[PDB]
Subunit: 134 residues, 6 copies
């Protein structure tokens, strides 16, 4: 699937994380107020990160950061962290992406990892419905 980002201010940044064993951001793009971006998940990229005031549209619904198979994480407060579990018999926990208040994350279940653990106060969007940690 594909997602849409609209910038409500200047300073909105988006990051692309590689599909593979490790989860780090390799590219970053800057959006100005009123600009809109459309992107699709590809072989290289399986997840993205969003920071700043912006509007996000997805099949699950439309999400705004100012308000107070794939999944979406929105950080309600500071200290939000997410971990990913390795596929197969392996039992490692090596993924550490911290989301500050107002930031948003989107990721897909790939071969290298198809199970995720989430920490802190955040809002989760899924095909079933919307979930609030608090």
């Amino acid at each position: 699937n594909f997602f849409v980002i609209k910038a409500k201010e200047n300073g909105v940044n988006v990051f692309g994380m590689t599909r593979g064993t490790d989860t780090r951001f390799h590219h970053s793009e800057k959006l100005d107020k009123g600009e809109v971006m459309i992107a699709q998940f590809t072989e290289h990229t399986s997840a993205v990160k969003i920071r700043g005031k912006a509007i996000i549209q997805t099949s699950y619904g439309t999400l705004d950061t100012e308000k107070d198979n794939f999944f979406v994480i929105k950080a309600k407060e500071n200290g939000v962290n997410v971990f990913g579990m390795t596929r197969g018999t392996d039992t490692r926990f090596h993924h550490s992406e911290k989301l500050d208040k107002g930031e948003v994350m989107i990721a897909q279940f790939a071969e290298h990892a198809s199970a995720v653990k989430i920490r802190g106060k955040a809002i989760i969007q899924t095909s079933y419905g919307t979930l609030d940690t608090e």
Copy 2:
């Protein structure tokens, strides 16, 4: 498909059972109050077990343990047991997983077993509807 677990208290534990001839738990993870976990069925794992106060969301619906193709078993009282039948001409009965009151189980129909027998008082969720043993 994939499922979501939300912890309403500390002490919530989840177990992963291997896909194969035998059904035993090999890994266990601990969730704190307010944490949320998302996982998908993979080649290694075909079923899971849940104990403690937690909220579970599935395509069939949202299930809570505090209230008093794949299937979900919720133990209404103690003494709940489940058995699985072997595929093909074989007629063995070698699966014994006991669920205490408040515990929940989720499993998929795999090649090694695609028929299940359930004992005791429990609540069953399926694509057709919700069933109560009592």
Copy 3:
């Protein structure tokens, strides 16, 4: 697809009939009052038989025996019989399964047979709707 059986009394029995040229029951299982069973059609088995007071859930709907692609046969009275036609140019009639009052049958259209003839007073469930012989 898969079906669900719930036992309203003790003495409920279920039979599994082999997928192949001949239609005979090779395995039988016993259910106690309040127990529930879930099974899926496999390579070995293409049809089943049910006797006694029980509740059956299917995509077509939920069926109870006490009330007075695949198909379901419920025997309204004694003397219910079913015959199956052989696939291809062959014109044999070699299937004889008699259903007593209250018994239920479920079968799938397989390569060896994809056409069925029914005798006696019975209730038929199909993807189109419910049919009564009387």
Copy 4:
């Protein structure tokens, strides 16, 4: 797909026509009052003919003869005839099946023929809707 026939009287007969270059009936079966038959289209058979008082259920709907991809033809009066066109560059017209009042026909679009011409007064059922020649 598959169809269902229910007999409202004795003397109801059904015919099976072969899938191939020529369209003739090779087998015939007799149904008694209150009996029901279920059959599926196979490699050998691509069409059938029905005569007498009977009830027919199909995805398009339920049809009764007493009332006054595949298609269904019901003869409103005597003199109903149907012709089939050969696939490809050929322009022959060699199919002649006459339907008397009350008779019903069902056929599938096969490789040897995927275009049909109909004569006389008849009622036609299709995935789009019901059509009356008069």
Copy 5:
């Protein structure tokens, strides 16, 4: 998909145009008042033409000529013409089929051509909706 033609008068004619580089009519059939024809698009034929008072049923809806992936063209007045564009880098315009008032055309997007230009006053039916040139 397949379409249905019903003749409201005598003199109704239907034409079949070949699937290939060139678009000419090779076969023609005559329908009498009250007759009905059903045909499916095949390898040889990708489009048809209809003239005279007739009733046409399609997934988009039912169309009548007397009223004053594939597409349907109905000529509202005389002088209606249609052109087809060649697939790939080629930029030819070699298709000229003129439709008189009351005539109807149906065609499919094939490998040799998947883009069409229409002239004159006509009514167009598509999966999205009905369009009127005027």
Copy 6:
């Protein structure tokens, strides 16, 4: 999928852009007032451009230029520009198509590029909904 263009005036022009590494217009066609065109995306072409008063119909809805997987861009004012990101590890920005007020653009996500950036004031149509930059 395919799209439909209807011309509300003379002077309406449509352009076809090649599927490949570079995005330039190779062919151009002229439409007169009241004419209608239907075209489908092919191997050669993955996007188009529209200028002038015209009516466009798409699965997302019907769009008119006079009003004041694939996506549609409508330029609300002058200065609208769009950029496309290269698939894979590459991080180039080499696409520059400027849309004047009233012009419309349609494009598909291809192998060479599946992520787009948009500038200026424009109206965006997607399977999720309609988005306005302002």
